[PDB]
Every structure is written in C-alpha cells, then in structure tokens.
Structure 1
C-alpha cells in the first residue's frame, strides 16, 4: 500500500495561537523516536482529539492496498480494493511544496514537506531520509488512528 511514512506521533499542543477557524484545530505534535514535527489540522467535531494523545500516522500513496492509481473519483460502492479501513481518519490531499534547507553546494538534511489536505493543511518536517518518499503534485492519503 505504498506506506510513505509512519510513526506514533504525540499531540503536544492543540492550538498555539487561537481558535482561528471554529471546527478546525491545528494539532502541533512531535513524533517520538524519529523526532519529526507535524502541524496537522483536523475536523474537531468528527475526530475529537485531546491534548497528549498518541496517534498512528500513515501518509500512504494508495488506500487500495493492492497497488494501482486512484483515478481521483469517489467510487462510492467500490469495496473491491478492501483498502486500509482499519484507520479512522482518512483525509485525502495533495503536496504543495517540498521545501528544504540546501546551500548551493550541498543537499539539505532537514527537508520540510508542506502537504495540503483539502484546504486544511499539514507540515511534516524532519530528517531528510524519512520524508524522502514524497514528491510535489501527488495525491497522498493521511490515515490516523488513536492508539492508547
């Protein structure tokens, strides 16, 4: 299923400045063990999250799980992929920029990858090797599940 990155991240703040938009809150979290920060935005009403949670994040290239391209269509009745239904927050999306910190002479070692999920936004940032999978203009699913 092209899992592109995975970790159990930890919610270290829910809204650094203010509740700017009412039903969307920007969890700012630090992953444990790879030290990669996240700044996801989540629909609080349908996925209530609370401070201190540990969630499994699996930005995956495909939901189907058998490979194959999305076609980008809400094929509603399709169950044939038998995709990653285990997780409980699948937001779809796109990646808008893959900024980094490269001097002209050498490549960066702290790539930051801004990923846009339908207006709500995310910035996984961290060691270059881990985010190496991502590429610009690709649809990348975000899947999350809250783990005790």
Structure 2
C-alpha cells in the first residue's frame, strides 16, 4: 500500500497564536482512534477548513498505491492510477525531524514527526508505534479528505 500513517482528525484550533499568513492557516487537530496530535499548515485559500471539521489524513510514501516510487519529479502526464484521486487536498513534503521521549537507556514511547511541504510544516505526535514508518529525509505525501 505504501501508506505510512492513516487516521481521522478533528480540527480543534485554526490559528491559536493568530493569523500569521493570509493564505495559510495552522490547523491544530487531534485524532480519536490513535490519539495523535496534529499541527498542520494548510493552504486555506484553495482548501478552506473550519473549526470542528473532520477529515481523513493519510501520510503515504507514494501516490501510485502500487509500491512504485514516484522519484520526486512533477509528472502531470502520468496516467497511472493514483491514490490522490480519492482525496481532495494532496501535499508533497519531506520529513526533516523525528523527535521522541527516548532516554539514554529507555526507548521512545511518544514520537514527533515533522514534515515540510515546501515550507508548510506538519508535526505528527503520538505513540512511537504509530510513526514507525517515518524516516528523516524521506519524501512523504499528505492526503486530506474532509468528512461530512
């Protein structure tokens, strides 16, 4: 499947500190299944998001849903079936930091994964087992679908 993480999030705050940028809002969302905390920068102009909105978030290493690596270049002419067809908001980014509660001896129980989608930042907190597919410097796809 090539899916690193999938869950349903509910928007709690849209911009707690304030509207830092006009076309981008910082969503503060929490999941109910895995109880993962999500901070996400979204292009609010093209994909408006409101408080209490529920959406399905999928973090995948590829869009082709066949295991084939995208190679990270723009290929609009590709007709291969894409997992992006099922989602409304698709972002391509790079994970640049993986933090955790690890100590010198004990491992990490909570992991934070930071992804930059061309400058739009996402932090995904929660149990380490839920973020084992995240490896720093790896390219990931963010796929969002608002749920009614």
Q: Is the 8 A contact 1:62 1:141 kept in 2?
A: yes
In structure 2, the CA distance between the partners of 1:134 and 1:19, relative to structure 1 (3 Å rule), is same
* Residue segments in structure 2 that go unaligned for 5+ positions in a row: none
Aligned residue-pair number: 148
SS in structure 1 opposite 2:130? helix
**TM-score when scaled to structure 2?**
0.96
Whole-angstrom CA distance in 2 between matches of 1:80 and 1:5: 22
Is this contact kept in 1: 2:111–2:128, CA < 8 A?
yes
* TM-score, structure 1 as length reference: 0.96
Q: CA deviation at 1:84?
A: 3.1
Cα contact 1:28–1:40 (8 A) shared by 2: yes
* CA displacement at 1:101 relative to structure 2: 1.0
Deviates more, 1:16-25 or 1:81-90: 81-90
Q: Give the number of the structure whose residues are more often strand, by fraction.
A: 2
Offset at 1:83? 3.7
Q: CA RMSD in A?
A: 0.9
Q: CA deviation at 1:97?
A: 0.7
Measure the CA separation in 2 of the matches of 1:82 and 1:50. Answer: 27
Q: Distance in 2 between matches of 1:72 and 1:141?
A: 10
2:2–2:66 CA contact under 8 A, matched in 1 = no
Contact 1:99 1:112 in 2 (8 A): yes
Give 5+ residue unaligned stretches, structure 1. Answer: none
C-alpha displacement of 1:21: 1.2
Give distance in 2, aligned partners of 1:12 and 1:82.
30
For 2:34 and 2:26, locate their aligned partners in 1 and report how far apart those are by CA, in whole Å.
21
In structure 2, distance between residues paired with 1:94 and 1:64: 18
Deviates more, 1:74-83 or 1:55-64: 74-83
| Deviation (angstroms), 1:35 | 0.9
Q: By how many angstroms is 1:115 displaced?
A: 1.0
- 1:120, CA displacement in angstroms? 0.6
Deviations 1:43-71 (A, max 9, x none): 01100010101100000111011111112
CA distance in 2, matches of 1:24, 1:17: 13
Q: Runs in 1 of length 4+ with deviation above 4 angstroms? A: none
